[PDB]
């Protein structure tokens, strides 16, 4: 705080909350740390002065003048003419682009009490005396302008209020308290005595105790907090009187001990210890290849001289630090840049690990993830989740700052981690990892990048010629490439027409936009890697993009000007909502603390997509400005997020609206789960897992023990939640045998969402829209080859072979509560055999007659012709070869599997021998039994010699596919995303397409498809997908991928799933109000309203007791536009409130304005058409389309038949009742509701 | 009706905004102004920026000709946080668009009753209470606790007449306070 240069009496001496500089000639400059500045002149050079604020000639009008001496008509240019001479990249005097002017509608809220309230010239407002002292009209405009443009946070509010209060207090007029009533106070440290009047220049500790009194030290009072009582206010804080009090050598103030290098040459440590007031000084230095310099913070210190860079290409191609280029393929996780030993002299380990993964064709490896362990902390970055940060197994928000180290932030597309040491890591996904290693380390490094001894040849010599010696961990079968040994290496000749400019041609010597980088970085070695990618995968944009993008990024690192390199036709780039592409932009976008990172920023303009009119929040989502989350013990949490700051699930803290951390006390959860860290979240997770096996078509297995052979032929509810739980996920399982044991049309209902999984032929989950090849959401469905795997968000999984074989694995915390055909979770099958009413039915056929699923057609028959079909009972006694067939396959000498040793095959052997004897043999029954057991072993991966050998059982593939008992079809296939669980930790039977191939829902394409992979699903080429809420088009095209321009459905149609595909089509419910002022009712009818006023139109009038919510629409038929009686506003009286919509203005819920694209009340969607019409929809209810021109259509589903009764009439389909509801004439006047109708009773009286 | 001096009876209260005795509006602080134009105008609301547990209340009054074009209050829409309560002296009471019996409790802690004379009274616990006269005269009563918290046509409860009459507005606050939700468009009707 204090400093006296004494050269011309230059004394910077500051108060409690100021920074005051003083000179001989009365220059009074002070600066509050948060955008508050003051410059005062004592008539110094009154004749003239060059500056932005006046020439001090006593005339305000003459101030607007150029430095040249002429006046300026425009204030922008005039202000920009007074800039400091220097290089100014990305400095705009005004917002050249579209500036987000704040709306005029919400200015009322920002103007009323609670926001810039006392600032208004009101008598009752605090510090009302200052109104006479200073005219606050200019201050009033500033407050509202700042808050309206800003997000509305209270910080700017009281900042402006404090600025006005201090400015008006400097005149010497007393100020009353305002912070408490305004709600914004200061949590000052130490004594924290918030004084309305506090003595300026508070008591400090003079190092030599000999100084003059500053002029500003004698004057008026200042508001603020003082802790000078007790502890003296010294050393920029409040210190006990026996504090450091500076080092007072030459008058300089060095409080406490900062280990500050005295000399500028850094040769002497000289830590000033307050105990002895002496210099603990060492003539040594860091050495080790690093030398001291002036750091940007201001304190000089050691710094590495040179920085070396090792980069890992994308297919892979690895270069060394010394400068050696090599290329290999593999998938086992390896190390990277591992120090051989811990650095003896003040340096830590920095070893990194890299994993590799197979995407697309074989002999191709992509970088899966990179994990860095430094300073005892381990954090990882992976391509599977982009622009997100994972540390020590848990996800955190991106702006993660540790103390002086580990400053992780987001730079363009890349995410960058840097520490105190020179080691820095930059990762962007899609196979590009850049590691900057300082030369300060030793010349010997046991890393995959190689020792940096500056010799390329010695790189990778200890590891041997094979670059796979640096191996650690890894998968059990990583080394074994394929049953055919390490297939399809690309042609070394690389015979492709892909040397042309169109593909892999812009990278090297195309002139055009990429020419300037040729002199900077040699492009030949980058070019060579692009042709191998073109070789392995032919012309697919997904593989082609990473190579050229890596070249562009490596180019931009050195300062260069690059032209427009990517085009919609040639490798277009996608980005989430509220984000636009940028060829090169800000290197450090802002985070919740609205500033760039303290490290060097904006030094390079970086390729990537950035937000607009919103700031990056938590590394994603481009949240609207003014809605940051909360900061808690160094961790940033999104607003509304629920988390446990401590382990053991102690407290569930909530991120409050204005950053408050609202915390309560947790109950440590039920003793069936454990508070564990998995999937990046610490929470109580289930620890037990059971299985329910519906082996075969009719035979079932209880949850525990005895199997209950049931020969029913109808829909039966297998498992469902019987005792409701306040917190859980419900799921109902039903096996709809189509006809007399036909393959079941299985249906699952999880979290109120119906996932089909029904169409077992091929793979066709249908849920609601039958076209679901690969999909995610609440439920993830993965085509495990022939089998289909369904997984929930909570670990519940079920496998269906598609041929009437169900394996459910239920690990959820439903111990006891769950009940049904599988049974309760407990020790005995007897508990499973209990009935809901307790009446045990000895006949197993009677069991399930109560647990019968609906949807049966005209009843169903429960039983064989002769019940139990005893024909097979007698035959097997003389048919000992039938049991000899299956058993010999699964006997111990028969190497069918190793899982039968792990899990006894007795149940499946009994199933095989119990299958219909008349149908028994080596028939479909035997083949299905073997397939079912070998697909049930998939639960735990085991070596499994094929279940089918040669011609014994029949199986084939569409085309170009070979059969393998150990196949991982979940990855290495059509999709660029994976919902696999390691293929559920199983390589299984199925079809593996060869050479250049993809796998689109069974079919194989020679790698010319699957470029369209959206977040939801796999979009085949030349297809389209209309998403929810009439999201019109996400059309896929061969030339360009994912041109997802969205629009809305035209009038007279509703978005509803039809013929297994979701789009908008005409619906039966249609009541149009006044086309030419004529009302067409549900049934065909015509009538003119003939009189202005509000009239009810529809209502689910009582006496029917259906779950359709009470809806009461009204329409204010008013003159409005040219007295044409168009609909002006649509009041909708939902059971939980009133929703009002007007085409011109916004939407009102309960009397409050809301944003147009939002969901309100209970399941009510409100949206505005791009044309301007407004649409409101209710789930399973009415939806209203209000036209821009004033035309309203009411649409009702066909389900409501003669239930609603109103002006539009019933839905019975009879015109005579619909037109007149037992009323002689004019139903409109009868339907005029009196609530909103004006009295107008005897007005002329 | 509020407990005073340890005994429960009804006494005068500080909050008093009478709408149109002779068509003149007396605000919370003493003020006078004629509405001068038919239509619905907002009267009070706990406008945001204060964060007090008083529920969001938004009263409106359809000043309409009605009896001999005397601009008496005809109906009182009250926009409680959980719905709309509409009361008319002649007919019954509507909650969310459904008729209800006069002596009942509805929504959250909202008492509605009909006076033996014929006036209708609605009260909110720790909130506003409105008395709608049989002849068409409305009084809005607010507890003394709400001091300079509500802001509307009746103005603040600070106790200063100059701010209460004009809320930083030169003239005719009524037209400024005309809510557009229930106001008819009437835009270019003669066009
Ligand atoms: C001074 O500079 C301003 C801004 O460039 C220019 O408009 C003006 O004409 C200049 N005047 C003279 C005399 O050069
Ligand atoms: C990297 O350092 C961490 C520090 O604990 C160590 O556990 C890990 O094994 C090291 N990596 C390798 C590949 O040795
Ligand atoms: C399961 O068997 C045990 C052992 O006899 C018995 O105590 C228990 O009651 C049985 N379960 C039920 C639900 O009856
Ligand atoms: C998509 O575009 C046209 C549509 O008929 C066709 O010529 C082309 O072959 C289609 N693409 C594929 C992969 O079939
Ligand atoms: C008026 O009613 C008639 C009935 O035939 C029909 O033309 C239409 O539904 C309405 N509108 C116009 C513009 O005629
Ligand atoms: C009209 O305003 C005046 C204001 O002095 C006063 O008489 C009264 O409040 C209002 N009503 C009548 C009938 O005068
Ligand atoms: Ca001047
Ligand atoms: Ca070397
Ligand atoms: Ca049991
Ligand atoms: Ca009808
Ligand atoms: Ca007032």
Automatic annotation (TrEMBL), chain A:
Q: Where in the cell is it found?
A: Secreted
According to UniProt, the name of this protein is Mucin-2
Q: What positions does the record give for glycosylation?
A: 68, 351, 828, 1022, 1078
* Residue window of the full protein shown: 1343 to 2583 of 2583
Q: Where does Ca(2+) 1 bind?
A: 55, 57, 59, 62-63
Binding sites annotated in the UniProt record for Ca(2+) 3: 704, 824, 826, 828, 831-832
> Where in the chain are disulfide-linked cysteines found?
95-99, 102-148, 116-143, 130-168, 158-184, 188-225, 197-221, 201-217, 205-245, 227-238, 247-272, 266-292, 270-281, 286-302, 310-449, 332-478, 340-446, 481-486, 490-535, 504-530, 517-555, 545-571, 575-609, 584-605, 588-601, 592-628, 611-622, 630-655, 649-675, 653-663, 669-684, 692-822, 714-860, 722-819, 864-869, 872-917, 886-912, 899-937, 927-953, 957-991, 966-987, 970-983, 974-1010, 993-1004, 1012-1036, 1030-1055, 1034-1044, 1049-1064, 1071-1208, 1101-1205
Underlying gene? Fcgbp
* UniProt binding sites for Ca(2+) 4: 1083, 1210, 1212, 1214, 1217-1218
Q: Which organism is it from?
A: Mus musculus (Mouse)
Q: How does it assemble?
A: Homomultimer; disulfide-linked. The N- and C-terminus mediate their assembly into higher order structures to form filaments. The CTCK domains of two polypeptides associate in the endoplasmic reticulum to generate intermolecularly disulfide-bonded dimers. These dimers progress to the Golgi apparatus, which is a more acidic environment than the endoplasmic reticulum. Under acidic conditions, the N-termini form non-covalent intermolecular interactions that juxtapose assemblies of the third VWD domain (VWD3) from different CTCK-linked dimers.
Domain VWFD: start-end pairs: 308-487, 690-861, 1069-1240
User: Binding of Ca(2+) 2: at which residues?
Assistant: 322, 451, 453, 455, 458-459
């Amino acid at each position: 705080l204090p400093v006296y240069l004494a050269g011309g009496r230059i004394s910077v001496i500051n108060g409690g909350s100021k920074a005051v500089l003083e000179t001989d000639f009365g220059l009074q400059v002070t600066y509050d740390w948060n955008w508050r500045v003051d410059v005062t002149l004592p008539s110094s050079y009154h004749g003239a002065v060059c500056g932005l604020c006046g020439n001090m000639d006593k005339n305000h009008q003459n101030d607007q003048v150029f430095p040249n001496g002429t006046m300026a008509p425009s204030i922008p240019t005039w202000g920009g003419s007074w800039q400091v001479p220097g290089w100014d990249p990305l400095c705009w005097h005004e917002c050249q682009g579209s500036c987000p002017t704040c709306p005029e509608d919400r200015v009322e809220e920002y103007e009323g009490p609670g926001f810039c309230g006392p600032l208004a010239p009101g008598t009752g407002s605090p510090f009302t005396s200052c109104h006479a002292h200073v005219p606050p009209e200019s201050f009033f405009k500033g407050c509202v302008l700042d808050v309206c443009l800003g997000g509305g946070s209270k910080d700017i509010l009281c900042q402006a209020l404090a600025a006005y209060a201090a400015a008006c207090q400097a005149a010497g007029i007393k100020i009353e308290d305002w912070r408490t009533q305004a709600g914004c106070e200061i949590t000052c440290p130490d004594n924290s005595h918030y004084e309305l009047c506090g003595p300026p220049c508070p008591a400090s500790c003079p190092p030599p105790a000999r100084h003059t009194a500053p002029t500003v030290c004698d004057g008026p009072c200042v508001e603020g907090c003082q802790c000078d009582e007790g502890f003296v206010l010294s050393a920029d804080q409040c210190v006990p009187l026996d504090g450091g009090c500076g080092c007072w050598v030459n008058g300089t103030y060095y409080e406490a001990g900062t280990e500050f290098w005295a000399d500028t040459t850094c040769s002497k440590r000289c830590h000033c210890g307050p105990g002895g007031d002496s210099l603990v000084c060492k003539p040594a230095s860091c050495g080790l290849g690093e030398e001291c310099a002036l750091l940007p913070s201001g304190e000089i210190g050691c710094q590495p001289t040179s920085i070396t860079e090792c980069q890992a290409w994308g297919d892979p191609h690895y270069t060394t630090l010394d400068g050696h280029r090599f290329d290999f393929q593999g998938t086992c996780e390896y190390l990277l840049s591992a120090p051989c030993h811990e650095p003896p002299t003040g340096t830590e380990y920095f070893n990194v690990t890299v994993a590799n993964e197979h995407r697309g064709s074989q002999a191709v490896s992509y970088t899966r993830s990179v994990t860095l362990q430094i300073y005892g902390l381990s954090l990882t970055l992976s391509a599977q989740w982009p622009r997100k940060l994972q540390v020590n197994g848990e996800f955190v928000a991106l702006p993660f700052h540790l103390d002086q180290k580990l400053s992780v932030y987001i730079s363009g597309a890349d995410v960058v981690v840097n520490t105190a040491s020179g080691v820095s890591l930059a990762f962007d996904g899609d196979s590009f990892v850049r590691l900057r290693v300082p030369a300060a380390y030793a010349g010997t490094l046991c890393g995959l990048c190689g020792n940096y001894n500056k010799n390329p040849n010695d790189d990778l010599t200890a590891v041997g010629g094979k670059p796979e010696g640096w191996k650690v961990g890894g998968a059990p079968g990583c080394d074994q490439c394929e049953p055919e040994p390490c297939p399809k290496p690309c042609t070394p000749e690389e015979q492709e027409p892909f040397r042309g400019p169109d593909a892999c041609g812009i990278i090297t010597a195309p002139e055009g936009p990429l020419a300037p980088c040729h002199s900077l970085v040699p492009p030949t070695q980058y070019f060579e890697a692009c042709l191998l990618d073109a070789c392995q995968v032919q012309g697919h944009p997904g593989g082609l993009c990473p190579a050229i993008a890596t070249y562009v990024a490596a180019c931009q690192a050195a300062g260069a000007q690059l032209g427009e390199w990517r085009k919609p036709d040639f490798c277009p780039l996608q980005c989430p909502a509220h984000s636009h592409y940028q060829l090169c932009g800000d290197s450090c976008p802002v985070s919740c603390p609205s500033l760039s990172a303290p490290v060097g920023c904006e030094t390079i303009c970086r390729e990537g997509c950035v937000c607009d009119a919103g700031f990056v929040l938590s590394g994603d989502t481009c949240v609207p400005v003014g809605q940051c989350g909360c900061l808690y013990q160094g961790r940033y949490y999104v607003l509304g997020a629920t988390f446990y700051p401590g382990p053991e699930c102690e407290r569930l803290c909530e991120c409050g609206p204005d950053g408050q951390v609202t915390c309560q006390e947790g109950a440590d959860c039920e003793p069936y789960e454990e508070c564990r860290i998995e999937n990046g979240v610490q929470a109580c997770h289930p620890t037990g897992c059971g299985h329910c096996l519906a082996n075969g078509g009719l035979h079932y297995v209880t949850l525990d023990g005895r199997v209950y052979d049931l020969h029913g032929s109808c829909s039966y509810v297998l498992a469902s939640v019987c005792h409701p739980k306040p917190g859980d996920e419900e799921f109902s399982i039903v096996l709809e045998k189509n006809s007399a044991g036909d393959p079941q049309r299985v249906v699952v209902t999880v979290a109120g969402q119906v996932v089909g999984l029904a169409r077992g032929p091929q793979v066709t989950v249908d849920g609601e829209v039958v076209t679901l090849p690969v999909a995610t959401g609440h439920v993830s469905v993965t085509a495990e080859g022939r089998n289909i795997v369904l997984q929930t968000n909570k670990g519940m999984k079920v496998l269906f072979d598609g041929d009437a074989h169900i394996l459910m694995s239920i690990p959820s915390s439903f111990r006891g509560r769950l009940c049904g055909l599988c049974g309760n979770f407990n020790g005995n099958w007897s508990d499973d055999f209990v009935l809901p009413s307790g009446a045990v039915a000895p006949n197993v056929e009677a069991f399930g007659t109560a647990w019968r699923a609906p949807g049966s057609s005209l009843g169903c028959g429960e039983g064989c012709g002769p019940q139990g079909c005893p024909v097979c009972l007698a035959e097997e006694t003389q048919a000992y070869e039938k049991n000899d067939a299956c058993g010999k396959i699964r006997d111990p000498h028969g190497p069918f599997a190793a899982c039968h040793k792990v899990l006894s095959p007795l149940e499946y052997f009994r199933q095989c021998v119990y299958d219909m004897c008349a149908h028994k043999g080596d028939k479909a029954y035997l083949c299905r039994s073997l397939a079912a057991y070998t697909a049930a072993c998939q639960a735990a991966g085991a070596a499994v010699k094929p279940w089918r050998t040669d011609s014994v059982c029949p199986l084939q593939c569409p085309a170009h596919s070979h059969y393998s008992i150990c196949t991982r079809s979940c990855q290495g296939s059509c999709a660029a995303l994976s919902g696999l669980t390691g293929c559920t930790t199983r390589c299984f039977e199925g079809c593996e397409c060869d050479d250049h191939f993809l796998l689109s829902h069974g079919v194989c394409i020679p790698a010319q498809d699957c470029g369209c992979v959206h977040n939801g699903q796999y979009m085949p080429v030349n297809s389209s997908l209309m998403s929810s809420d009439c999201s019109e088009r996400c059309f896929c095209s061969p030339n360009n991928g994912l041109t997802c321009h969205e629009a809305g459905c035209p009038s007279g149609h509703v978005c509803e799933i039809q013929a297994g595909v979701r789009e908008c089509q005409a619906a039966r419910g249609l009541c149009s109000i006044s086309v030419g002022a004529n009302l067409t009712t549900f049934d065909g009818a015509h009538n003119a309203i003939s009189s202005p006023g509000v009239y009810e139109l529809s209502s689910r009038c009582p006496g029917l007791q259906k779950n359709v919510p009470w809806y009461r629409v009204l329409a204010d038929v008013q003159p409005c536009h040219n007295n044409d009686k168009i609909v002006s506003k649509v009041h909708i009286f939902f059971q939980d409130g009133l929703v009002t919509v007007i085409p011109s203005k916004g939407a009102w819920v309960n009397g409050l304005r809301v944003d147009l694209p939002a969901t309100v009340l209970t399941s009510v969607s409100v949206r505005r058409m791009p044309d301007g019409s407004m649409l409101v929809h209710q789930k399973a209810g009415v939806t209203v389309w209000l036209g821009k021109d004033g035309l309203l259509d009411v649409m009702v589903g066909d389900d409501l038949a003669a239930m609603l009764c109103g002006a539009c009439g019933n839905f019975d389909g009879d015109q005579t009742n619909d037109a007149y509801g037992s009323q002689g004439k004019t139903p409109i006047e009868k339907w005029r509701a009196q609530d909103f109708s004006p009295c107008s009773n005897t007005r002329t009286r």
